[PDB]
mmCIF file of C-alpha atoms in Angstrom:
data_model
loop_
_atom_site.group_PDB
_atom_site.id
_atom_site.type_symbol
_atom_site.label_atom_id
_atom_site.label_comp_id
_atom_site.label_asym_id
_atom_site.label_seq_id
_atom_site.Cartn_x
_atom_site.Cartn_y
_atom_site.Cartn_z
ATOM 1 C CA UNK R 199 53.294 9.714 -11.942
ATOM 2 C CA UNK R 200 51.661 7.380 -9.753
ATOM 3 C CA UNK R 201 53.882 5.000 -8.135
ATOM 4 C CA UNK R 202 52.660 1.193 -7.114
ATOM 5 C CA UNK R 203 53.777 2.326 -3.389
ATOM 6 C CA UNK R 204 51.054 5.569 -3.681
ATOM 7 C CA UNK R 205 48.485 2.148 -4.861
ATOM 8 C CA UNK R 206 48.886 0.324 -1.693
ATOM 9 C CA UNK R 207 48.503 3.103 0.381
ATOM 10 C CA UNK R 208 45.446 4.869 -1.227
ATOM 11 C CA UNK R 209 44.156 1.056 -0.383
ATOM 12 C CA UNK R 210 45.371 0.959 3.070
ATOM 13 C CA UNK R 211 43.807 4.412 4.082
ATOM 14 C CA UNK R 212 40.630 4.548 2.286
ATOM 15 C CA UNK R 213 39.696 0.987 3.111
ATOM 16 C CA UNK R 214 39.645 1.296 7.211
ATOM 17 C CA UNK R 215 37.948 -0.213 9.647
ATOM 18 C CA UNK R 216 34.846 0.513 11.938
ATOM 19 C CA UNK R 217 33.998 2.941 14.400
ATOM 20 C CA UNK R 218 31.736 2.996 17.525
ATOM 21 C CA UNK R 219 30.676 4.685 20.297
ATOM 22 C CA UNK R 220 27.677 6.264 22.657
ATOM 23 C CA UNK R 221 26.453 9.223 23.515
ATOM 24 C CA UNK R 222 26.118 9.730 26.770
ATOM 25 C CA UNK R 223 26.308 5.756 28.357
ATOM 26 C CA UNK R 224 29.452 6.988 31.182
ATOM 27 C CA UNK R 225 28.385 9.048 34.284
ATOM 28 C CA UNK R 226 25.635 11.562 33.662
ATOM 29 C CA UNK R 227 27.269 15.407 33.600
ATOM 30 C CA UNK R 228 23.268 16.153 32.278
ATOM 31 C CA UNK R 229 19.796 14.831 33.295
ATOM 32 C CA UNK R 230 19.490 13.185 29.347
ATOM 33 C CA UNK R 231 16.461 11.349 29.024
ATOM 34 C CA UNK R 232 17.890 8.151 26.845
ATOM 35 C CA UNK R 233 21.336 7.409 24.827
ATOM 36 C CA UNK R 234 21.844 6.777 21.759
ATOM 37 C CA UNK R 235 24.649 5.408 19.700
ATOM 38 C CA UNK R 236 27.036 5.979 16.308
ATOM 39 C CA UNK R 237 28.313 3.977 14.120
ATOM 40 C CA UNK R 238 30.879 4.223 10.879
ATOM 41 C CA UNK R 239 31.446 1.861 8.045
ATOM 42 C CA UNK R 240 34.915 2.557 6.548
ATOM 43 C CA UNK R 241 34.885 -0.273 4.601
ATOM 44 C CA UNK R 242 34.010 -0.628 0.801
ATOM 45 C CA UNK R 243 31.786 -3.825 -0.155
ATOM 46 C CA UNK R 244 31.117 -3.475 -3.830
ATOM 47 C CA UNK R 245 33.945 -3.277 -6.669
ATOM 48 C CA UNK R 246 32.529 -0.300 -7.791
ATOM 49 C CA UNK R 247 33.573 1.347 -4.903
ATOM 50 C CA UNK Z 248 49.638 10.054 32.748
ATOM 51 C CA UNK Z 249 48.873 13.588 33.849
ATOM 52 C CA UNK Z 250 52.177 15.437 33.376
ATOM 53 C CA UNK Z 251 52.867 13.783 29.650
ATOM 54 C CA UNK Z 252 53.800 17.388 27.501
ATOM 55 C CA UNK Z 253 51.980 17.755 24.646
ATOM 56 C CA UNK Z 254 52.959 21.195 23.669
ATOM 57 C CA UNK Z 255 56.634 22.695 23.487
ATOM 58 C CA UNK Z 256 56.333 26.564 23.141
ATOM 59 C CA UNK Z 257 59.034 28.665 22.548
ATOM 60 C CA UNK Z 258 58.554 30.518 25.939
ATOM 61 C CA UNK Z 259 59.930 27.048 26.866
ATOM 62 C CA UNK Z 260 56.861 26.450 28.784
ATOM 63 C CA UNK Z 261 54.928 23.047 28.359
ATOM 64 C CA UNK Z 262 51.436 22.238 28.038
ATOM 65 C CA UNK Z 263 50.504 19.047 29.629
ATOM 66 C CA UNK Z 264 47.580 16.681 29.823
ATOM 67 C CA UNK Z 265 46.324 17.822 32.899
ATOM 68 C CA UNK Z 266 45.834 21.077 30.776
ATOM 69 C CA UNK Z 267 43.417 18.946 28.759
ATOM 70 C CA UNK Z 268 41.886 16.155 30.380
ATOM 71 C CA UNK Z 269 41.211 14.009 33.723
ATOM 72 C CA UNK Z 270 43.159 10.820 34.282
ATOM 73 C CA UNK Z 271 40.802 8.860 36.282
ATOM 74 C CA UNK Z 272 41.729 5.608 37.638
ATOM 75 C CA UNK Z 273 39.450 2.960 35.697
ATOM 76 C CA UNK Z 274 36.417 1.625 37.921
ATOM 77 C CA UNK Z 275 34.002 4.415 35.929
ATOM 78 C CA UNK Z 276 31.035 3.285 37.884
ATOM 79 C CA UNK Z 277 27.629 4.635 36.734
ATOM 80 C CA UNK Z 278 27.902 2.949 33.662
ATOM 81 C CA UNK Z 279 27.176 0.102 35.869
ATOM 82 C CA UNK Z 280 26.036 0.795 38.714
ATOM 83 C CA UNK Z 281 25.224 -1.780 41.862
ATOM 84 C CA UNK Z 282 22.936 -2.232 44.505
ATOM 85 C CA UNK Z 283 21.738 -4.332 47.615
ATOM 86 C CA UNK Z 284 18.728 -3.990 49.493
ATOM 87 C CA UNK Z 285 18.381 -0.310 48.166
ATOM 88 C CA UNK Z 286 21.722 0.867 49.316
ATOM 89 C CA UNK Z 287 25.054 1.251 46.803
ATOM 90 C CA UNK Z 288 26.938 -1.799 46.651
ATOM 91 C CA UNK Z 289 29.515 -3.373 44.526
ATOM 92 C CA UNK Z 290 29.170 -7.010 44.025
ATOM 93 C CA UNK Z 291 31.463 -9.365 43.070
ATOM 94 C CA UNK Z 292 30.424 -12.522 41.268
ATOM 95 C CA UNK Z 293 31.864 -15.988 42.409
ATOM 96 C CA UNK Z 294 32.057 -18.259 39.386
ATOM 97 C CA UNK Z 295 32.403 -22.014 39.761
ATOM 98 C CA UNK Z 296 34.974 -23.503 37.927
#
């Protein structure tokens, strides 16, 4: 009961972008000693996947 | 950009943005900050064309 519509947007969703930030790099609220970054790969290299 | 409603209730009151956040006006020095001969400056750089 899976229509080709529910096939392109299983696609669209689980194959996102990226996503990127800092932890602390804007105005200091806290005395932190260095900052440190994330990252998040939303994006599926091999077939398998 | 601070009295966009987020919230209706059904007391008919609204929850806004300023409920929830700051709406600062860009600039958001120290993440760069600037100096000149010790004391705070901002510089502006004069590129040739």
């Amino acid at each position: 009961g899976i229509t080709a519509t529910d096939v392109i947007s299983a696609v669209n969703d689980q194959n996102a972008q990226y996503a990127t930030g800092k932890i602390g790099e804007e105005p200091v609220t806290q005395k932190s000693p260095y900052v440190y970054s994330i990252t998040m790969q939303g994006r599926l290299q091999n077939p398998s996947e | 950009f601070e009295n966009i409603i987020l919230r209706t209730n059904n007391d008919g009151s609204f929850l806004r943005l300023k409920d929830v956040a700051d709406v600062e006006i860009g600039s958001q020095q120290y993440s760069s900050q600037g100096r000149l001969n010790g004391n705070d400056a901002v510089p502006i750089m004069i590129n040739l064309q």
